Amino acid sequence: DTFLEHMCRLDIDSPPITARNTGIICTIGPASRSVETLKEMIKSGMNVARLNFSHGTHEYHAETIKNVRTATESFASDPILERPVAVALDTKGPEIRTGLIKGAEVELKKGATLKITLDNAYMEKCDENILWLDYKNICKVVEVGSKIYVDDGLISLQVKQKGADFLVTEVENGGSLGSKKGVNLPGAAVDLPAVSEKDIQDLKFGVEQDVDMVFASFIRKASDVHEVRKVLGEKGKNIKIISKIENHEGVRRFDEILEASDGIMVARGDLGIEIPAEKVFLAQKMMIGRCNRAGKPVICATQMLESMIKKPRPTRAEGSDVANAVLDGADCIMLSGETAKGDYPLEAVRMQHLIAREAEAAIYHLQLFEELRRLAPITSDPTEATAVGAVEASFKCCSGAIIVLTKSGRSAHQVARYRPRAPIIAVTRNPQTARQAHLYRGIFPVLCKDPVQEAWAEDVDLRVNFAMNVGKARGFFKKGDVVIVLTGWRPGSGFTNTMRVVPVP
Amino acid sequence: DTFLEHMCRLDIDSPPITARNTGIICTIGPASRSVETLKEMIKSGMNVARLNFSHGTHEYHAETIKNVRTATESFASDPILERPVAVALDTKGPAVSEKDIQDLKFGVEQDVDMVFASFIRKASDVHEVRKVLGEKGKNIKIISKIENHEGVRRFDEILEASDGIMVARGDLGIEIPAEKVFLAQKMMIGRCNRAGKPVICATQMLESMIKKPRPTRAEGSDVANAVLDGADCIMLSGETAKGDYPLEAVRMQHLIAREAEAAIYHLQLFEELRRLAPITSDPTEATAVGAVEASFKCCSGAIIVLTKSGRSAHQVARYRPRAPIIAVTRNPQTARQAHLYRGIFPVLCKDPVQEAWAEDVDLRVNFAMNVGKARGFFKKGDVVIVLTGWRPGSGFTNTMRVVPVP
Amino acid sequence: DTFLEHMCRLDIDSPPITARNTGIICTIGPASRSVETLKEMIKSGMNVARLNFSHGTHEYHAETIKNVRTATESFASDPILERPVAVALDTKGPAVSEKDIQDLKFGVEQDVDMVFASFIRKASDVHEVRKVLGEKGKNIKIISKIENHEGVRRFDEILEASDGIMVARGDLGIEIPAEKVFLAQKMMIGRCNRAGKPVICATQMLESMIKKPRPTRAEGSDVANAVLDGADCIMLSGETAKGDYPLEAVRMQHLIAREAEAAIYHLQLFEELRRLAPITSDPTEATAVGAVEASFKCCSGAIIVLTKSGRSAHQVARYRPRAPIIAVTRNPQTARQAHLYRGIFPVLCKDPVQEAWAEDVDLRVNFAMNVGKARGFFKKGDVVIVLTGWRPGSGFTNTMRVVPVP
Amino acid sequence: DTFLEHMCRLDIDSPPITARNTGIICTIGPASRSVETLKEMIKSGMNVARLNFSHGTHEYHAETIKNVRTATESFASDPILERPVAVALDTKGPEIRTGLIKAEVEKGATLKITLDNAYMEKCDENILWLDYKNICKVVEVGSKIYVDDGLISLQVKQKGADFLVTEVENGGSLGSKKGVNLPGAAVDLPAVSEKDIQDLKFGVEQDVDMVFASFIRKASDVHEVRKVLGEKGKNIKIISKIENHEGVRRFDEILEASDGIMVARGDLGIEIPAEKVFLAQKMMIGRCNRAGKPVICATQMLESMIKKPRPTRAEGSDVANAVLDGADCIMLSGETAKGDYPLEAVRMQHLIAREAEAAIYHLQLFEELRRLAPITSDPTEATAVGAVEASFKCCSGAIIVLTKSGRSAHQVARYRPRAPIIAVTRNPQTARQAHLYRGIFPVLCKDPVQEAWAEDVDLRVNFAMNVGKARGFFKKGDVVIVLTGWRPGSGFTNTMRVVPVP
């Protein structure tokens, strides 16, 4: 194997063989939340439920959550279809908008001159003379010459003059303007509502409904992740924080943002507003890779299967975008409007699956490990040695999977860092961690209900059995195959794990 | 170090430094048939103008061809900031259409450098193209388009007997689904990368620009991946053929494909190609490998390669140098023709052959050296590789020598 | 990081670290039949005593055998500082003589652990040896002696059906030239090293020592290379059977074979062995692999295998750790037989099986861990590997555990 | 492929198919100086003639050098058997010895050492005399003292001014005028003896190629030999011998002052234990390959052949491992020098060193160098790599380097290509000073310089090409790598050529 030989090897007439190891994330809204539909999506690929909180009442969303779990335990008895499904709360996050034009729309021209006001007296009065935006400190951030984007980039402006609560500007790019539309100020250290006053109410609601992770919107500094961390508080200290990066300053300070966050979202489109089309894919590839390094998870969202909103199949251009995002090393890719409000929210999960599977054939597979095996330094942490021993063993006998008995999920994280080829089956009694686990590439979680036992050995022996049967049923392996097992820690005890190579009964 | 460590280091705040190494092909048409316009399209990065035969009588084309050439030479007053422009005949196709035979003869006798042959499915399907071009077109390079499913099915044999390959993704995503086409593309490119023959990615490039001065970041990303998949050229269509911002289109494509460059892992692309290549015994190839290895060993500003038929510069290119291959030639066909090759920056020598064979060589090498300087690639004091023959008439380019810029 | 950088680093002023990992076999005769002597030979490094069955009859062997065991057990005082001592019957042959079969029967029925069967040629021969030993001694180990050109000619099939190989360079020196014999030795040792089956090389070791208390530096060198070639044991002949300094001869063999260690480059020997070996369906192999691989990842002070059969400890040995393999066993034949393998230090558990498994395992594991400390292999605080089973009477050793020395 | 796979491939029924690439050094005296014998040895593999200066009058040696160059140019009548034999001067160097036994005498007993010159011819098993005047100055109570081929170690119970009283340890038949050793003390200079300077002078005069400086124990020691050879001998290669502990101790500085190294195994074997010597060997050879510098393995090699027609298997293998460790040249002594089989030894020596090539991990060796080696700004380095790569790209029969100095054909060797480097030269010295280098085969150009550089190159290239065919390095219709030289002004840059064999 060389990488290039591997590319020449590819075969579009050969059917996928590997598990899809990328977790699918779906945004639930209007078209998706009916328990029956929700049931179909779980069954047909879904791994996480996104809640878009720039909308809804809490009563709206709490019902949506209730439906999710209804559909989840709808499969309670059957090992063939039982999968954890997780719930993710995506805050609305700090944002700027324009006013209401005559409150309906105006029209903007090229090169023309625009004035902007903070003056709320000019809130519902809005047009080509003056525009108003809810940001009150815009003058202490923006300087002369600064470009300002408006309504999904579609209209840019600059800055000729700036004083106190006004700014005279000059349109660089034109197009029809409208009411209450989004505004970005590229390269600008946007002064802070760290978390919105709304966000704290949705964060608290989040803690209340036992969500798994928060996708914290619009993150710029370390402190920002630290805010959501604190607001979540002792009450919510196992809620995973995934910071969205949606603007230039995020890419800039991305190093400390990853240190603080539990994970990372690449908002491609929102990135596309403040930084040029020719530069974004670098920034994506950079962030993804830096996460793969950090061992933290990375979600790839925006502009995925959006064709599927009105058609039952995606454009080939879109087939590409996802695949070459699987490949740069995203753990998960998130569907947006195609599940939340489309006319094909079902095919969308279906396609997104089909696609993410095909793409596994092009993952440079065996080599991925072989590299970090070597270069990896010498430890003294036994847990490290044990995982290598496991992934090594994994490869010594083409095992069909590596069953890891974990509470936290940590021990099955470690193992995934060494990127084995065979899937990791993370077996857990903590129904949380089972969910907070789709965030991780090539980990397939499995919920153990059978309860704790006195003698460690016979307890371990039990869940290994559980995994073995689930595994047989999914088709991870037959009888008379070998599999690698990490037990957990014994509960005396030295905090040491145990690697086992056991044949499948 | 590592592929991954590369990705981690990427920075969208530090300007690209390497030059674009992927060749921009453009489809010329109503939006761009203007001589006055083409003077801005090659100044902005066009390296091949493509003619779409699907819509034309010869007088339609012949005038356009003439208009291309007319604007090419409008720079000849500076022999170094000057650059070749090939011309491409893209057949209308459906085997070999009998309309086409009437059109191939037009090309053959219009000095077209390459033929993008259409709906190619077999060896017979390209052999049949070949003979039609005849002895008056034994040179002219034919690039098969893979469009049906069978092209991907019988690809090796097509590659076996073609000069180039064009993947037309649109016309692929129609016979085969989306979950599979990107797979098809990656394999093809990769397979041309091995065999040495050049490959170009076409269709759905910067389409959104047909009605807008900037493109979608989804398009920036589709184009750059073709770059990094190992493509030599990306070809524009409606963006410059019938578009509304054709010039603006080209400049973007350049901009993109230059950014893209920051993400190619050379230090391993080379390594793998070198490892796969056979032990063959062209004196002329063995120099290339040596030439590349040495370019890496001293971090050379460029590899200068004096060549007749291009084939020398081709070989150096096969092994993917980090540094630019400046091909120096008089044969201005294999010079225009050069552009279907990654990282080759061909340059036309207009100086009358010199009396002494040493004097001749020294002139051409000092030319490339002066092109390379003003063009940006190196500065006085740097180190460059240089390939020349040992004597003249040697059916070989097999001298290699590391020499400082003056 | 490089074979060469290792070589440059060596130091004749730096006292050695590693324990000798190569087995010392000695030949018992007049100079060493003594019990008073043997008590000083095993104390000084003998791990397998060899009875030379060319010149002798059974009563004289039986007294020597008994002499050995009498001095062996004379250290049973501490169950920790005591070492197994295997017993070797070296047949005389010139296929299988009547005198052999008579002598083999004496061996099979004397608890001998291994038979060095002489002048083996084709596959048929070891087979003819097997039969002789029958079900009575199915356990005894067959070490094929290679002594002429036919051995080296048909070596694969021989190896394919012996338990081990002895290279007799002297007797191999007669049959083929000097300039080729090292070539032959290097290949055999290396072929055994692959196959996993242990190799001993003998003859021309420390002959000079028969008369002198110290050997020639060319003997120092010849032995050390046999070590570095990948031998498991080097065996002394006349040096200790007749020599005026037989005991003095062993300490040197140790001393040399220990210094030799500093020039082994494990950090590759492992990587190569591993790269060559195929995938298993057997859990007990895969664990070894993982264990040795883990032993490098954390620089483990040792690898502790708990084994019945031996096969568990043998596996770990095949992949060649830097770390010493302490095999803990009850079966004291395997404990003895264990000496045939590089870097396995076998220990005998004289403790009676415990009631619970947990109980049983934890005792044997604390055994090695104590023996370990007692020797030099680790100190309190170090990390070690530990390879037990899961349920008892399981077909396998397949538990990998990384534990701190208490 | 992998090292171990390689070890498994080895076939003793398959005949050697590689150039010997270890140059053979023979010691010449009594048994070997007849021109007619020297002829048969040159034909049979000799590459360097050693002269042992512990003996012989200058006119003795003077003649011996002449007979060599007589038999050398005996073949120059053609270019096919003609090899550039080289001449090496081996100083006798500093020595400490003991007087005449009052021809000798002889465990646990107590013995007295005297500086007292009156006792010179008055030696016996109670009193012993030795030159080294400062012997007591570099000793404490309990320092070992070895005597007569290490045969008699001794400690020291007490010392004062002009006497040492001490205990026997190892014993056996003493003799007279037998050497003594002090492991491992900073032994007193002069580095170069009085006799040494006379012989180094005669060396420069008789135009030898290299000197083998005996007993080198520091950098100072090297520089003394160098300044003695002086401006007149500035191109005579110095190969420091390492014969004691201290040499090994300070071996780093000794290696950069020297042009080369000799591992005196047996002399090493008397001051440092038999269990440690082979480490010292591998260590020194090892550091030398890393240094570019040549390494010669001497002593113990074929001494069995002094009285038998063939060597013992232990001896065969010792040499083979000396080759494999990384030695460029392995030197014969008494077996060529004064034996009953001198021709037969150079034969066996060659045979062995060839067989051994099959077990050198050939194609791998290079691959490490390519990666590990850094970035240069030194065009000459890149061209070398370019050449060796090209060498490998088409399995060249050889890599022909046109060199004056030999510098450039050295680089190429630093990168361990697998094809023989045929070094083509006009300077008939840097041409003999060239066997000291592994897998370099020199060839002497007689044909004279031309003003048209292009055609001067074209000429020697042709020369080499023909030599090469005849030696058997390559047929016609093969490819070969060429480095031309530097030009003539000029840009000091070399030129790599892939040329087919006409």
Author numbering:
A (entry chain D): 24 to 126, 130 to 531
B (entry chain A), C (entry chain C): 24 to 117, 220 to 531
D (entry chain B): 24 to 125, 130 to 133, 136 to 531
What did the authors write?
Pyruvate kinase isoform M2 (PKM2) converts phosphoenolpyruvate (PEP) to pyruvate and plays an important role in cancer metabolism. In contrast, PKM2 has low basal activity and is activated by an effector molecule fructose 1,6-bisphosphate (FBP). PKM2 exists in a dynamic population of monomer, dimer and tetramer and its pyruvate kinase activity relies on the formation of the tetramer. Upon formation of the tetramer, PKM2 can adopt the inactive T-state or active R-state conformation.
Phosphorylation of residue Y105 inhibits the tetramer formation and pyruvate kinase activity of PKM2. In the crystal structure, PKM2Y105E binds to proline, which was derived from a crystallization condition and might have facilitated a T-state conformation (as did phenylalanine). No significant conformational change around residue Y105E was observed between structures of PKM2Y105E and PKM2Oxalate. The crystal structure could not reveal the mechanism for the inhibition of FBP association. However, it is possible that phosphorylation of Y105 functions during the dynamic transition, which could not be observed in crystal structure. In support of this conjecture, PKM2Y105E has similar enzymatic activity and tetramer formation (compared to PKM2WT) in the absence of FBP. In contrast, the addition of FBP results in significantly less of an increase in the extent of tetramer formation for PKM2Y105E (compared to PKM2WT). Taken together, the mutation Y105E, or phosphorylation of residue Y105, inhibits FBP association and prevents the FBP-induced R-state formation of PKM2. Interestingly, PKM2Y105E showed a slight decrease in activity in the presence, but not the absence, of FBP, with a kcat/Km of 1.2 in the absence of FBP and 4.3 in the presence of FBP. Phosphorylation of residue Y105 inhibits FBP association and prevents the FBP-induced R-state formation of PKM2, but experiences minor effects in the absence of FBP.
